[PDB]
Coordinates of C-alpha atoms in Angstrom, one line a residue:
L4 CA 17.7 -11.6 0.1
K5 CA 15.2 -9.8 2.2
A6 CA 16.7 -6.7 2.5
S7 CA 17.2 -6.5 -1.6
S8 CA 13.5 -7.9 -1.7
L9 CA 12.3 -4.6 0.6
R10 CA 14.7 -2.7 -1.1
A11 CA 13.6 -3.4 -4.9
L12 CA 9.6 -3.3 -4.0
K13 CA 10.3 0.3 -2.9
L14 CA 11.8 1.1 -6.4
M15 CA 9.0 -0.8 -8.4
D16 CA 6.9 1.1 -10.8
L17 CA 3.8 -1.5 -10.9
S18 CA 1.8 -1.9 -13.5
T19 CA -1.4 -4.7 -14.1
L20 CA -0.7 -8.2 -14.7
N21 CA -2.1 -9.1 -18.0
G22 CA -2.0 -5.2 -19.3
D23 CA -5.5 -4.9 -18.0
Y24 CA -6.8 -1.3 -18.6
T25 CA -10.1 -1.2 -17.1
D26 CA -11.0 1.7 -14.0
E27 CA -11.5 -1.4 -11.5
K28 CA -8.2 -2.8 -12.2
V29 CA -6.4 0.5 -12.4
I30 CA -7.8 1.1 -9.1
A31 CA -7.4 -2.2 -7.8
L32 CA -3.5 -1.6 -9.2
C33 CA -3.3 1.3 -6.9
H34 CA -4.3 -0.9 -3.8
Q35 CA -1.7 -3.4 -5.2
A36 CA 0.9 -0.9 -4.6
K37 CA 0.0 -0.2 -0.9
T38 CA 1.7 -3.1 0.0
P39 CA 1.8 -4.9 3.4
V40 CA 5.6 -3.9 3.9
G41 CA 5.5 -0.5 2.0
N42 CA 4.5 1.3 -0.9
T43 CA 6.2 0.8 -4.4
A44 CA 7.9 3.8 -5.8
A45 CA 5.3 4.2 -8.5
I46 CA 2.3 2.8 -10.6
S47 CA 2.7 2.4 -14.7
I48 CA -0.8 2.9 -16.4
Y49 CA -1.7 4.6 -19.5
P50 CA -2.7 8.4 -19.4
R51 CA -6.3 8.0 -19.8
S52 CA -6.1 6.4 -16.0
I53 CA -4.3 8.9 -14.4
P54 CA -7.3 11.0 -13.0
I55 CA -8.9 8.1 -11.3
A56 CA -5.4 6.4 -10.1
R57 CA -4.9 9.8 -8.8
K58 CA -8.3 10.1 -6.9
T59 CA -7.7 6.8 -5.6
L60 CA -4.2 7.0 -4.2
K61 CA -5.1 10.1 -2.6
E62 CA -8.1 8.5 -0.8
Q63 CA -6.0 5.4 0.1
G64 CA -3.3 8.4 1.8
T65 CA -0.7 7.5 -0.2
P66 CA 0.4 10.6 -2.2
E67 CA 4.1 9.3 -2.6
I68 CA 3.3 6.9 -4.9
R69 CA 4.1 8.4 -7.9
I70 CA 1.9 8.1 -11.1
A71 CA 3.9 7.0 -14.3
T72 CA 2.9 6.9 -17.9
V73 CA 3.9 6.3 -21.3
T74 CA 3.9 8.2 -24.7
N75 CA 5.1 7.0 -28.2
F76 CA 4.2 3.9 -27.0
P77 CA 4.9 0.9 -27.6
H78 CA 6.0 1.6 -31.2
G79 CA 8.5 4.5 -30.6
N80 CA 7.7 6.0 -33.9
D81 CA 9.9 8.8 -35.4
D82 CA 7.2 11.5 -35.4
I83 CA 7.9 14.1 -33.0
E84 CA 4.8 16.2 -33.3
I85 CA 2.6 13.0 -32.4
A86 CA 5.0 11.9 -29.2
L87 CA 5.1 15.7 -27.8
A88 CA 1.5 15.7 -28.1
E89 CA 0.8 12.5 -26.1
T90 CA 3.8 14.0 -23.7
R91 CA 1.9 17.0 -23.3
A92 CA -1.3 15.2 -22.8
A93 CA 0.0 12.9 -20.1
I94 CA 1.4 15.9 -18.3
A95 CA -2.3 17.6 -18.6
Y96 CA -3.5 14.3 -17.1
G97 CA -1.5 14.8 -14.0
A98 CA 1.4 12.5 -14.8
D99 CA 4.2 12.5 -12.1
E100 CA 6.7 10.7 -14.6
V101 CA 6.2 10.3 -18.9
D102 CA 8.2 7.2 -20.6
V103 CA 8.6 8.2 -23.8
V104 CA 10.0 5.4 -26.4
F105 CA 12.9 6.6 -28.5
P106 CA 12.6 6.2 -32.0
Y107 CA 15.0 3.0 -32.3
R108 CA 14.1 2.1 -35.7
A109 CA 15.0 5.3 -37.0
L110 CA 18.4 5.4 -34.8
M111 CA 18.9 1.6 -36.6
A112 CA 18.6 3.1 -39.8
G113 CA 20.8 5.5 -39.0
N114 CA 19.0 8.7 -38.0
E115 CA 20.2 9.5 -34.4
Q116 CA 19.1 13.1 -34.8
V117 CA 15.5 12.5 -35.0
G118 CA 15.9 10.7 -31.4
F119 CA 17.9 13.4 -29.9
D120 CA 15.4 15.8 -31.1
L121 CA 12.1 13.6 -29.9
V122 CA 13.4 13.4 -26.5
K123 CA 14.8 17.0 -26.3
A124 CA 11.0 18.4 -26.9
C125 CA 9.6 16.1 -24.6
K126 CA 12.3 16.7 -22.0
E127 CA 11.4 20.7 -22.2
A128 CA 7.9 19.6 -21.9
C129 CA 8.2 17.5 -19.1
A130 CA 10.7 19.9 -17.3
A131 CA 8.7 23.1 -17.4
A132 CA 5.8 20.8 -15.8
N133 CA 8.3 19.7 -12.8
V134 CA 7.6 15.9 -14.4
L135 CA 10.5 13.4 -15.1
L136 CA 11.4 11.9 -18.3
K137 CA 12.4 8.1 -18.6
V138 CA 13.3 7.5 -22.0
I139 CA 12.6 3.7 -23.4
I140 CA 15.4 2.5 -25.9
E141 CA 14.2 -0.8 -26.3
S142 CA 17.3 -2.2 -25.6
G143 CA 15.9 -5.9 -26.9
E144 CA 15.6 -4.5 -30.2
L145 CA 18.7 -2.8 -30.7
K146 CA 20.3 -5.7 -29.4
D147 CA 24.0 -4.8 -30.6
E148 CA 25.7 -3.3 -27.6
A149 CA 27.2 -0.3 -29.6
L150 CA 23.5 0.4 -30.4
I151 CA 22.4 0.2 -27.0
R152 CA 25.6 2.5 -25.7
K153 CA 24.8 5.1 -28.9
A154 CA 20.5 5.5 -27.5
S155 CA 21.7 5.5 -24.1
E156 CA 24.1 8.6 -24.8
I157 CA 21.6 10.3 -27.3
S158 CA 18.6 10.5 -24.8
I159 CA 21.2 11.4 -21.8
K160 CA 22.3 14.0 -24.0
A161 CA 18.8 15.6 -24.8
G162 CA 17.7 15.5 -21.5
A163 CA 16.3 12.2 -20.2
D164 CA 16.2 11.6 -16.4
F165 CA 15.9 8.1 -16.8
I166 CA 16.6 5.7 -19.3
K167 CA 14.6 2.1 -19.6
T168 CA 15.5 -0.5 -21.0
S169 CA 12.3 -1.4 -22.6
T170 CA 8.6 -1.2 -23.2
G171 CA 7.6 -4.9 -21.5
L172 CA 5.8 -5.5 -25.3
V173 CA 8.5 -7.1 -27.5
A174 CA 10.2 -10.4 -27.7
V175 CA 13.2 -9.4 -25.3
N176 CA 13.2 -6.9 -22.6
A177 CA 15.9 -6.1 -20.3
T178 CA 18.9 -8.5 -19.7
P179 CA 21.7 -8.2 -17.0
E180 CA 24.2 -7.3 -20.3
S181 CA 21.8 -4.6 -21.2
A182 CA 21.2 -3.2 -18.1
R183 CA 24.9 -3.1 -17.3
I184 CA 25.9 -1.8 -20.6
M185 CA 23.1 1.3 -19.9
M186 CA 24.4 1.9 -16.1
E187 CA 28.1 2.0 -17.9
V188 CA 26.5 4.5 -20.1
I189 CA 25.5 7.0 -17.2
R190 CA 28.8 6.6 -15.6
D191 CA 31.0 6.9 -18.4
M192 CA 29.5 10.1 -19.1
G193 CA 29.5 11.2 -15.5
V194 CA 25.7 12.0 -15.3
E195 CA 24.9 9.6 -12.3
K196 CA 23.4 12.4 -10.2
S197 CA 21.1 13.5 -13.0
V198 CA 20.4 10.1 -15.2
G199 CA 18.4 7.2 -13.3
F200 CA 18.3 3.4 -14.6
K201 CA 14.9 1.5 -14.9
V202 CA 14.6 -2.1 -15.7
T203 CA 11.7 -3.4 -17.4
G204 CA 11.2 -7.0 -17.4
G205 CA 14.3 -9.3 -17.0
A206 CA 13.7 -9.7 -13.0
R207 CA 11.3 -12.1 -12.6
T208 CA 12.0 -13.5 -9.2
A209 CA 13.7 -12.1 -5.9
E210 CA 17.0 -13.6 -7.1
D211 CA 16.8 -11.5 -10.2
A212 CA 15.9 -8.4 -8.8
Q213 CA 18.9 -8.8 -6.6
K214 CA 21.2 -9.5 -8.9
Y215 CA 20.4 -6.3 -10.9
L216 CA 20.7 -4.0 -8.1
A217 CA 23.8 -5.4 -7.5
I218 CA 25.2 -4.0 -10.8
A219 CA 24.3 -0.4 -9.6
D220 CA 25.8 -1.3 -6.4
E221 CA 28.9 -2.0 -8.3
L222 CA 29.2 1.0 -10.7
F223 CA 28.0 3.6 -8.2
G224 CA 27.6 4.0 -4.3
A225 CA 25.4 1.0 -2.7
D226 CA 23.6 4.1 -2.1
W227 CA 23.2 5.5 -5.6
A228 CA 20.0 3.5 -6.6
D229 CA 17.1 5.4 -4.9
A230 CA 13.9 6.2 -6.1
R231 CA 15.3 8.8 -8.5
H232 CA 18.0 6.7 -10.1
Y233 CA 16.6 3.2 -10.1
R234 CA 13.2 1.6 -11.0
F235 CA 12.1 -2.3 -11.6
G236 CA 9.5 -2.0 -14.2
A237 CA 7.4 -4.8 -12.9
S238 CA 4.1 -6.7 -12.5
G239 CA 4.5 -10.7 -11.1
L240 CA 8.0 -9.7 -10.1
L241 CA 6.0 -7.7 -7.1
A242 CA 4.6 -11.0 -5.8
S243 CA 7.8 -12.4 -5.8
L244 CA 9.2 -10.0 -3.5
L245 CA 6.6 -10.2 -1.5
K246 CA 7.0 -14.3 -0.8
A247 CA 10.6 -13.6 -0.4
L248 CA 9.5 -11.2 2.2
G249 CA 7.0 -13.8 4.1
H250 CA 4.0 -12.3 2.4

């Protein structure tokens, strides 16, 4: 459990504990991402915090901690022009990665096309700027397995570089079942090289983190879940991992 905890830590998109948004808490988050045993994969912050976070990470000598942010968030509304404007602003602020919320309510009402179009539009903006696009399908609101598969397939076909379970701001975030469903879609469509998976929530403990990673190890190589293909979107999980590692 020390190997999986160190592994999970190096795959963490770290965010602040109680959704704090101040400059100091963002600065502190940057310090928190440089752990005693290694750096998290990224930090997750709102777009306006990107310039100060980028300054902070460089000054601590950790340019490899990626800066991830969110757009169309957390609502997942179905207005493409708004999602696209927010994504272009996230890019312009300096994001390394943009997590866009899929219009899951529209999909639930039978409008698959707007989710395809919105993801495609944001992917094209991100790809031209060498920015990775994660797509939050909000599996905890879709609830139905076939809807989770559907949102995953649409996002992948539209160009998602990652599919991400959840915003973290609804009642149900990631579960082991939705994680398996989403990773099964990646396998069944044959896109394991181009599409990663991100669990947001769900994992509270080091033991949780181990179990989530084992699903990826079962479906793909034990080598598949590197930073390009696997992330934990978490906050309190970092403390549990560090304690498992003796810190």
